[PDB]
Design a protein around this ligand. Structure first.
Ligand SMILES: NC(=O)c1ccc[n+]([C@@H]2O[C@H](COP(=O)([O-])OP(=O)(O)OC[C@H]3O[C@@H](n4cnc5c(N)ncnc54)[C@H](OP(=O)(O)O)[C@@H]3O)[C@@H](O)[C@H]2O)c1
Ligand SMILES: O=C(O)Cc1nn(Cc2nc3cc(C(F)(F)F)ccc3s2)c(=O)c2ccccc12
Length: 314
């Protein structure tokens, strides 16, 4: 149930997502999740709930439900902290909230640096994001130092397109290769090109929004719902599983890590029950065949950043 990273650590292939989990509900959600078997939690500073996630983690270690070494805890460096001089601080405030003394994995959350400040999305009066000078090679070096200092066991990247992943891999003096690239991926955005690139380079891919992020604040009525796709429902029924379990099992069979979010205990538990069945080889190609190149996770105010990752094909 885990995948070996290029740092020699093992990463559970199922993790719990925490974006949009309300601060008042995520502590119990992570407690239920660890009680039912999750050992990987996907966090971020920008999700504004790391303190409450960390309460849950701490209580389960105190309770001795689990050992720290059995947990795989991931967090991410927000965009307003790309400056070489800010990265360690940002890591330590995540560690502080999570009540941890190290992370298993720490990602550059997006390849785009924003102006530092306490606003997460600094905009100009016309609504464009205000970039920071910073480039991802100096940000990367700063991430490497977090390894050297023992704050993080592994480092990786998120939302990097293949030319940006290649930028890091061709970095002069590269000390630690990225271990993971965490990207949007589901039957409507199957990412074959970028996943093959990354796997070819020994970089593990984590699939985010594997259910389509139906709770994304900017969803519109017109938008498709993977959970309600009759095709996927038929595959589900054939296996006597739910559509969600199918959507979760699908990336697992492509040698991906997948991190479905829920704050509903019954769904946390259901979503983990995906080790007891297999999708067939044909199921898998059929699922891939639903690609629409429909991306749900992005932001118009950032399209003009020099490092906006989605103008490129992949
Ligand atoms: N690196 C990045 O840039 C990035 C971007 C996006 C997401 N992520 C990570 O990926 C995680 C997952 O992506 P996501 O939150 O965007 O969306 P998702 O996991 O694709 O969708 C979560 C939505 O599905 C619902 N849901 C969960 N299990 C269900 C089930 N069994 N049946 C029916 N509905 C179910 C959840 O409802 P309830 O919660 O109400 O039960 C919630 O509304 C995030 O939380 C975050 O950790 C990272
Ligand atoms: O970030 C998450 O985990 C979820 C996430 N996604 N988005 C959509 C985004 N689209 C982006 C595009 C770029 C870009 F790189 F393209 F410029 C940079 C930054 C972003 S944020 C949000 O606006 C957001 C806001 C609060 C908390 C989480 C998120």
């Amino acid at each position: 149930s885990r995948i070996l990273l290029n740092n020699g650590a093992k990463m559970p292939i199922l993790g719990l997502g925490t974006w949009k989990s309300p601060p008042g509900q995520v502590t119990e959600a992570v407690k239920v999740a660890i009680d039912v078997g999750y050992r990987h939690i996907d966090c971020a500073h920008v999700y504004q709930n790391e303190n409450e996630v960390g309460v849950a983690i701490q209580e389960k270690l105190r309770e001795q439900v689990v050992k720290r070494e059995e947990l795989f805890i991931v967090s991410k460096l927000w965009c307003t902290y790309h400056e070489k001089g800010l990265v360690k601080g940002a890591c330590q405030k995540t560690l502080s909230d999570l009540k941890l003394d190290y992370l298993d994995l720490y990602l550059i959350h997006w390849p785009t640096g924003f102006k530092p400040g306490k606003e997460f999305f600094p905009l100009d009066e016309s609504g464009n994001v205000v970039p920071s000078d910073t480039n991802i090679l100096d940000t990367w070096a700063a991430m490497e130092e977090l390894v050297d200092e023992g704050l993080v066991k592994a480092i990786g990247i998120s939302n990097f397109n293949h030319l940006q992943v290649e930028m890091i891999l061709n970095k002069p003096g590269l000390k630690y290769k990225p271990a993971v690239n965490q990207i949007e991926c589901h039957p409507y955005l199957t990412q074959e090109k970028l996943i093959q690139y990354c796997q070819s380079k020994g970089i593990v891919v984590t699939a985010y929004s594997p259910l389509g992020s139906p709770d994304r604040p900017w969803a519109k009525p017109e938008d498709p719902s993977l959970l309600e796709d009759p095709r996927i429902k038929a595959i589900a029924a054939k296996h006597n599983k739910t559509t969600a379990q199918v959507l979760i099992r699908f990336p697992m069979q492509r040698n991906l890590v997948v991190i479905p979010k829920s704050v509903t205990p019954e769904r946390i538990a259901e979503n983990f029950k995906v080790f007891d069945f297999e999708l067939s080889s044909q199921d898998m190609t059929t699922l891939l065949s639903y690609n629409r190149n429909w991306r749900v996770c992005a932001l118009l105010s950032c399209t003009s950043h020099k490092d906006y990752p989605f103008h490129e094909e992949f």
